[PDB]
Amino acid sequence: MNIFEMLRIDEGLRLKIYKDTEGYYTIGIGHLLTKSPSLNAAKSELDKAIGRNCNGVITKDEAEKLFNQDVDAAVRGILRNAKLKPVYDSLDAVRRCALINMVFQMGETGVAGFTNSLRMLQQKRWDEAAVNLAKSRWYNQTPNRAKRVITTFRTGLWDAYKNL
């Protein structure tokens, strides 16, 4: 299992503009287009993103291309971030993927706000950190996905995704 396979389980694949769990306009493998309410703003962002007139629909190919850009941007953002970088460096390869997953879902900023959990992960207090991560909007809004990520941080194994 790798980061791409993991995110693709969590996000799914949709070739037509769709709404987030959040109500936001998205396409592909969890690629947010706009937080704006107009399908029209969304369509516009889509064509800007792909470089063609898409009419709200993309190919698999284009979906994966956006996916490769998003994952790269997530990793680079972690590495540029003063709060994130140290945690990332301190973790093993599997847990590294769990932080990447959060950053992809919630952005650099959002994850950097989980001050106390970050602190515990750096200290390698896995069980404590898992309990602390669960106390969030994040877990309450998308509990099955949060729980997969959380188990990943707790165990350092890929089991949560085996099932799936």
CATH number of residue 38's parent domain: 1.10.530.40
Residues 146 and 134 sit within 8 Å (Cβ to Cβ): yes
Binding-site residues sit at: 32, 104, 117, 132
One DSSP character per residue, 37-85 reads S-HHHHHHHHHHHHTS--TTB--HHHHHHHHHHHHHHHHHHHHH-TTTH
Helices 143-155, 126-133: axis angle to 10 degrees equals 170
**Encoding tokens for residue 162?**
């085996």
Binding-site residue set for substrate: 32, 104, 117, 132
Structural domain including 50 reads 1-164
Tokens of 161: 């995704």
Phi, psi of 28 (to 5 degrees): 70, -135
Spell 119-157 as b/e; 16+ CB within 10 A means b.
ebbeeeeeebbbebbeeeebbeebeebbbbbbbbbbeee
Structural domains of the chain, count: 1
CA distances from 3 to 50, 73, 132 (A): 23, 13, 23
Q: Which two tokens stand for residue 138?
A: 């994040």
Q: What experiment produced this structure?
A: X-ray
- Tell me, yes or no, if 45 is annotated catalytic: no
Q: Are 56 and 47 in contact (CB under 8 A)?
A: no
Tokens of 152: 């990943």
Residue of 10, 11, 62, 70 marked catalytic? 11
Catalytic, out of 20, 89, 127, 159: 20
Neighbours of 63 (CB within 10 A): 18
Whether 20 is a known active-site residue: answer: yes
For residue 32, the cross-strand partners are: 26
